[PDB]
Design an enzyme around this catalytic site. Sequence first.
Site, PDB file in Angstrom:
ATOM      1  N   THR D   1       0.840  -1.234   0.000  1.00 15.25           N
ATOM      2  CA  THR D   1       0.000   0.000   0.000  1.00 15.25           C
ATOM      3  C   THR D   1       0.860   1.263   0.000  1.00 15.25           C
ATOM      4  OG1 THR D   1      -1.853  -1.071   1.158  1.00 15.25           O
ATOM      5  CG2 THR D   1      -1.763   1.335   1.255  1.00 15.25           C
ATOM      6  N   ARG D  19      -4.028  -1.578  -5.026  1.00 11.23           N
ATOM      7  CA  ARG D  19      -3.685  -2.996  -4.858  1.00 11.23           C
ATOM      8  C   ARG D  19      -3.851  -3.439  -3.404  1.00 11.23           C
ATOM      9  NH1 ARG D  19       2.142  -5.397  -6.834  1.00 11.23           N
ATOM     10  NH2 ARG D  19       1.094  -5.159  -8.863  1.00 11.23           N
ATOM     11  N   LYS D  33      -9.111   2.538  -1.407  1.00  6.88           N
ATOM     12  CA  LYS D  33      -8.476   2.824  -0.116  1.00  6.88           C
ATOM     13  C   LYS D  33      -8.811   4.211   0.440  1.00  6.88           C
ATOM     14  CE  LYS D  33      -4.648  -0.176  -1.436  1.00  6.88           C
ATOM     15  NZ  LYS D  33      -3.197  -0.469  -1.288  1.00  6.88           N
ATOM     16  N   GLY D  47      -2.330  -0.981   6.227  1.00  7.31           N
ATOM     17  CA  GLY D  47      -2.296  -2.001   7.276  1.00  7.31           C
ATOM     18  C   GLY D  47      -3.419  -3.007   7.099  1.00  7.31           C
ATOM     19  N   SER D 129       3.611   0.397   2.895  1.00  5.46           N
ATOM     20  CA  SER D 129       4.847  -0.273   2.472  1.00  5.46           C
ATOM     21  C   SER D 129       5.624   0.541   1.432  1.00  5.46           C
ATOM     22  CB  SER D 129       4.544  -1.672   1.926  1.00  5.46           C
ATOM     23  OG  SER D 129       3.580  -1.622   0.890  1.00  5.46           O
ATOM     24  N   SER D 169       2.481  -2.405  -3.583  1.00  2.00           N
ATOM     25  CA  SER D 169       1.584  -1.444  -4.228  1.00  2.00           C
ATOM     26  C   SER D 169       1.530  -1.670  -5.734  1.00  2.00           C
ATOM     27  CB  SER D 169       2.057  -0.019  -3.948  1.00  2.00           C
ATOM     28  OG  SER D 169       2.297   0.174  -2.567  1.00  2.00           O
TER      29      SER D 169
END
Lengths: 231, 196, 241, 226, 250, 244, 243, 204, 195
Positions: D1, D19, D33, D47, D129, D169
């Site tokens: 993410t 993703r 998201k 998360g 990430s 991602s």
Amino acid sequence: NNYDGDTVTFSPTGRLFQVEYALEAIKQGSVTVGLRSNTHAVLVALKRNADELSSYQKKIIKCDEHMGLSLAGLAPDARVLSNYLRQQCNYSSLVFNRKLAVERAGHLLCDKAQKNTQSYGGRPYGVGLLIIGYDKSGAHLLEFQPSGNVTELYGTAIGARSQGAKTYLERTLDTFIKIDGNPDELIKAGVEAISQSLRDESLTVDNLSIAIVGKDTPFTIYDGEAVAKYI
Amino acid sequence: TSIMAVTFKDGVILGADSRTTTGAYIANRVTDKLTRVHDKIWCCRSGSAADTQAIADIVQYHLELYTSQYGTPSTETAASVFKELCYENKDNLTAGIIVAGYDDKNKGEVYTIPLGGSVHKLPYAIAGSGSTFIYGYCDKNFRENMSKEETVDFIKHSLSQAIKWDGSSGGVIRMVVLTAAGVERLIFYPDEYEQL
Amino acid sequence: GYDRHITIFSPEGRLYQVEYAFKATNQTNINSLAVRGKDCTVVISQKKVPDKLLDPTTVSYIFCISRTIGMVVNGPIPDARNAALRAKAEAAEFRYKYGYDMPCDVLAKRMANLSQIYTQRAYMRPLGVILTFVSVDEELGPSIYKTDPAGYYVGYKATATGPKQQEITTNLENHFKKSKIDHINEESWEKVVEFAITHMIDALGTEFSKNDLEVGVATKDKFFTLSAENIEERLVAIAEQ
Amino acid sequence: TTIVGVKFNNGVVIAADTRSTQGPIVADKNCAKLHRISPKIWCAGAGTAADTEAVTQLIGSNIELHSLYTSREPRVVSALQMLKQHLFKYQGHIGAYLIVAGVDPTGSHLFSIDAHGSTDVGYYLSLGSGSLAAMAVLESHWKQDLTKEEAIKLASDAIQAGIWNDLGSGSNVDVCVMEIGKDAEYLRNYLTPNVREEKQKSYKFPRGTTAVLKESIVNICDIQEE
Amino acid sequence: MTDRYSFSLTTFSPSGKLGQIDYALTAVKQGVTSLGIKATNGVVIATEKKSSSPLAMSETLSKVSLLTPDIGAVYSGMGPDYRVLVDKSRKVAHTSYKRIYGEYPPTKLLVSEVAKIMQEATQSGGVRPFGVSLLIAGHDEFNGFSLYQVDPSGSYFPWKATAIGKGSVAAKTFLEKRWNDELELEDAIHIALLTLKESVEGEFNGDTIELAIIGDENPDLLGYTGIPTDKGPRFRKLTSQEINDRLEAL
Amino acid sequence: GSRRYDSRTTIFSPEGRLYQVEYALESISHAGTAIGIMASDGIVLAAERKVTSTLLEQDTSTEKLYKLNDKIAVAVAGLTADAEILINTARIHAQNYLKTYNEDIPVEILVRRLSDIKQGYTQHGGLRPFGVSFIYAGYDDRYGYQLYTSNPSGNYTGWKAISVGANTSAAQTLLQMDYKDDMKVDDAIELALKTLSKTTDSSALTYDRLEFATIRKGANDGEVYQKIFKPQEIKDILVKTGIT
Amino acid sequence: TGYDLSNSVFSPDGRNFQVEYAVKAVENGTTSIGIKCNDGVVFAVEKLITSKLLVPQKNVKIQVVDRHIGCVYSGLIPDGRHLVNRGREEAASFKKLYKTPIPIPAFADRLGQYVQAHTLYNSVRPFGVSTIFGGVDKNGAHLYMLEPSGSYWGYKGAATGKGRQSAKAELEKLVDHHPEGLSAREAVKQAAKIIYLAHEDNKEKDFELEISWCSLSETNGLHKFVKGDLLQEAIDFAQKEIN
Amino acid sequence: SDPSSINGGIVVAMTGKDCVAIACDLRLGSQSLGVSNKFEKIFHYGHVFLGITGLATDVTTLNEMFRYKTNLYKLKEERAIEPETFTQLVSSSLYERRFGPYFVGPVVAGINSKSGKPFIAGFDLIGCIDEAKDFIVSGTASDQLFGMCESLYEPNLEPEDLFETISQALLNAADRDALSGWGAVVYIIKKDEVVKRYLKMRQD
Amino acid sequence: MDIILGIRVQDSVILASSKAVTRGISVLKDSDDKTRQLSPHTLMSFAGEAGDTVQFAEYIQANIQLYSIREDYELSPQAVSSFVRQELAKSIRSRRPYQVNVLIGGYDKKKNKPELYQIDYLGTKVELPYGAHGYSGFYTFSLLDHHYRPDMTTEEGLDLLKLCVQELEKRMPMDFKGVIVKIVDKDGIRQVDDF
Ligand SMILES: [Cl-]
Ligand SMILES: [Mg+2]
Ligand SMILES: [Mg+2]
Ligand SMILES: [Mg+2]
Ligand SMILES: [Mg+2]
């Protein structure tokens, strides 16, 4: 009248009738006397029987090695309050390695009785108590009323016809306070005091109950042939 | 973290770096570690960012409610509320807080509250990972009753060294001055304090 | 006739305990007044110290609830302080939970909801007080919101409370009928306080010394009460024109 | 993410990739998201995906009730305070890492929230990430007094850095712009730089290819009359 | 302390009457008139803003309240009781529905929840009934437009059009003559204003009348764009000016 | 204290009657009449709405007949709000039983549970009883078609034909006269409507003043169908039976 | 009627008759007073000697809260003890959380809110005492008096019990004749006189005088009982004034 | 030890032109031991279909739970629940057990009765919604299913063509998983008819 | 305990359960009956952790007996098995779960059909023609898969059961001291006293 249905109601003159009715139960109870010198403190109690086949109701209860009381009124209420005193005396010894002061014991009894006079559902205690004891400040005598009022005295009496014994002690005040180091003479004065409250009946061997505590004397109760000496 | 509070003639000054880390990654390079719990009672935060923010917010609530009932609280009172939270929840907290404030009666005061939840009133205090490297410097250079300019220099030089040696500390040096005159914020950038 | 003792409906659909709580409101025999300026909100109240043994500095019916909100009470002091402590607690909790200062109208609603509960639940009695909340709200500006024992509340351009509220109310009504605006068109709070005191003098028909009044002022980011000497300066300016 | 937030002249913009993964497997290629807390308060989550939605909707629900109670439009600081206190109480076990942005009567705001309850303030932020890839772009191209057009460009460039360089991602870029005195514009699939190429072959089967044992009509209707 | 009123304060009398509910209805009868009319493409609810003082700002007192984006409510009776019911109704719409199904409740089910709260205050220990009657108007996808009345007992009934409070008997007669199944929303608003004028003594204008509709979706009131399926609230409160415009064509 | 204001809802009279139960039954006697008739091939539920209005939306209205599950339904007489509290509890109980045993709840078990809840309010808690009487119409594979009634006391009994609400004395006499054991649903429909037509306090019995329902095995093969009649369907059955 | 049978019930006047009946119990009690001096406060009380059998100086009525607050009351003595026990819990928790000893105005409200709470419900009875209390804090000396309704104000001088009218008149003279103020040692002497003068309302039985004080100069801001020579000096001063 | 792979099994769902398909294997096992070849994992509440993989006790429990809830829904709402609404109910119900979850992988499939729009959705064990346009997979051979679906799937397939695609996706995925197989079922769902087909496959 | 088997034939259900009880080192008993009659036409065998097995079985027995008295009616095997499953499914997330696996053999008097249900400690229920718990299935299922027919007589079912027990006695390391066999049919429950 309209204000005596429960303990949570003041009257128009600011009286609490349920508390006053609880006070009335003490006046019906049998006479008991308390008096002290500087070395010792004494309780004398006239025990009451139901009939000739029955035993005489016990009036004196031990709370610790250095403290105890006599009762007049509802006996089960005295058992509840004396049990509470036993616990408080005991908490003091276990936690603080300290014998509970007689004055502090009076304060604890006052506060316990008060909670029953300000809340709905409950009722006042129907018993009066005379607490004697010997602590770090010498001999002590207390009078407990179920209104919550606790008073420290040289001598007193509660129960039926208690006014006679109270007047006698008021005259003898200067004499019996000086009876130091002589337990027998202090008890004699107490037996002579309670005699001023008797009518028709006299002090017999299973009628009389005496207790004493002092400088080198643990709280001990005398009944039966142990009080024949004082009859 | 590198944080410190220093009392001086006119009151007290709080100082701090601006680096917040997650491991070796600097999660925030412009953090404000100097936090207001009352008009002239501030604190410096070190340890878990979550814990110290939660504590400071609760203390701010307690002192706001204190003020509405009893008027302005003392710095000692603010330190006590911090201590109560840190001591009673010591098993679940990782917080090292320095409390600094200005009264008119008591003037500038500093209280430090380490991990355990103990309280220590001091003329000045240092804390955070970077403080270890300046115990020697601060002890040699601190004087009581310094001027505002001297105290600003003492804090600037001290945190400069803490930043130089501690990887966990860095960024800008923030300061908050507490006096009778009011509340003044100061900021000092790397190009300034690195050449000291 | 136990429908008059607890908060249940009478045959007429009335709550007598609520009505009698309104009557307790005037037990202190004190009148209060609130008005709005351009940048401020002013509240004034009569101060009566009948006993010489009293410390006059401790006699007050105006409360500082939060930094921004002030509250004047009409009713007995025990119920007044009960409401004051609760309002202070509610204002502090609000700030902690939602991250911004509790608005004056929101606090009024909250205290009004609490009052409503006492009119519905039997074991709780109503408080015999009327609460007037004042502030300069960051969204709505100068604000006056008033709560009563029924659980009713509403905003006001200006308002009055006490035994002689009607006389003060009509006096204020007539002024706003002339000016045709919802506030006192004045820059400084000092002159808005002077307006408030003048119009109370006119309505009640009585003169005031520095110890006969009590004043509270709300500005942006703070509410404060005036001292006796601050009020004296106000009274002097009124007399000189 | 990868999720970012960027302040500009008259508001704030947030962005995110699309993703969502189960270990090394891509569960959904076009995930959403960017969540709505209130009409003009939006947040992006990284998360544990269930936690970020659950915590966003709970606070969003309470924010709505609060707005009705107070007769005021919701504030970002209220969403922030309610989110961090909830997350602190659960000691990090609710794995929600959020970037909260919005406009209200006080102005425009941008905050980040960690699962343990720590919050921070900034002009530019990144989480997830791919936050290091995104933050590299933000640290290279951010300046004071960005325009609306410049902020959208910078935000999407930061997400692209995450898309191409972080394996966690991928796919598309979602954007939401919140400007003062305007409706918030949610730009779903603002960029689409990862369309799959046509396959070499069609895999449509001839009818009757699959072996069948039994056929039967399933009664989805209720019990009938007569 | 402790709440020691754990017994019912509403009980059956020898004649089978629940006294406290009857007395609550009497309180509603004294209350200011409010009404509701259902049209083919909408619903209207209206009432008088009976201001207690001219110094009071009557805009700060809302008699017509939004419960959900597609549901609104008005009352007659005790105002404070209404205010707390609106708070409870708003919350129950979330806790017992939206947090479960991810959508707002249909009109009939939200009404059902409000009714339950009002019934419990008629049987639970140490409480009196709510002294209000509610009129709840709303829309939902599968039931369309609807209008409900809720009483102190907890009972609720669906209406084409009705009135409650002070002059309800006369108002209901007026509505029976005018209502038909082919009414457009504007026609229903017109009839609502005509009906309400009869029960109002003093001033009759946009500042003394509160009126709201459940009608078309308002994308301009949504606050955001970008999601096609979200088209905005059907509840809309008419402004003071919008009311006065329709009082000229009266 | 609080004792002063306590009505004491759960006490006996000197004659050994429960005051509140008796007074609740007095309340129910003023409610609209509800009738249930059991036949060999089904059950009929008929009930009268109380003095309605022309502006009441009938097609979306429900005050008398409620569905508990696919096999069981109830007719209500008394306080509607009180009935809905109990109805929801009964719906939950049926689902609890279905989850536990993976079989539809037998009619009597559901009736006993609701009746026990009513009983509790007469013996403890100091609350007023529910002012509701139910007629339960249901089917299960043990006893087949069943009719029960329960009242505020929590007592329940089984019936071939029964009425609750207003004019039950007159209604029960008319049912006792014309009911036979080999009766069919279509005949029972006619009896129910004829009985209401004679006992009603209204001038005439029309479609807008009625709620109607049948439980039939007139569902395609071995299964049971519930039919809550629509306003137009009640109008048709009134013409068919020759009442309008 | 019936409005006076239950606590927390408003009469048609807007009065709580049960609270007014509690005042009657206060008016029936012995006289107690409080005097605010230059740097502190003085408390005094009348103790009726019902009998010779009462041990002198033993049945102490005045009570300390924390180490800087004194409390005295008239009316039902057990009710007063219950109130002081609560006060001690309030003072303990304040010092626990905030470190500093509870300020007197802060302490006053704690008692006030607790007494007021006993007028909100019919499940409790109002307090049958009026309590005079005070002490020294960071802002100086404070004297308060608290009624059964929960009402309290600050005072220059305060009095309650059977001889309150007599006492009040004497206190009002001191306020007028000393605008600059009264010293701590003067206040002890004056307190003795006022109790002796107020004893005319209870003239049937003889009494015992009990005095306490908190002063910044004389007691370091701590509550102490007046004993021995200083007590006898005040008794002599009092006896001289009545003759 | 791992609760999600004790019993084994798979579910797959796909969309087509005016239709949806949902399919599952029939195996229930105790790790290596095959216990049952008749354990169906697809259930339906009205016109909404729910597939559930994972721990078998929880599969049974959740079916009974959603039957319970959709029955009460219908009685109160007076209408059958729709796929979009049911999806939210599954998500809510799973998240309420956040720190003690049902070890399952649910899959919703159905057609909205009012709009006619085909709908599918998937969830993780704790409630996160994956609402894809094309296909949803679940179970011990989800990796294999992702591989089949990604290559075999194309949009707007007719009901009878969609049947072949989803059947071949399931079968070949199951044959590469030890804990899946032992029979299979495919549901083809249109707006007002549903056909159920049992497939012939290898029984090892 | 150890081995419990079940087989459903034409007109009855047959349950076989081992007799041994082992306390670690020694075999304390060789005649233990690992079964309880829940109702006249429903039998339940069990195996799992010591103590929990009997405590659970008797608890279930008491509940079904209570139902029978209250309603004056015997629950169907399907209804009993569902009740048992729910109790185990409830148990698995408790503080201390019941570690008990069961087989429920019953004859449905309404449908006139025998029924065999296999439920493990997790609450995993399956209806089967033949079933087992533990390692018992590993040895016996290959024989049952070969020989089983749905139209078998009770005598043929017993013979197929003997072949299963013989294979267990040959290849299992533990001595389970033979099995007690019980038959459930339209006439109720009876024990085969020679096996
Ligand atoms: Cl509230
Ligand atoms: Mg560094
Ligand atoms: Mg009340
Ligand atoms: Mg395989
Ligand atoms: Mg194999």
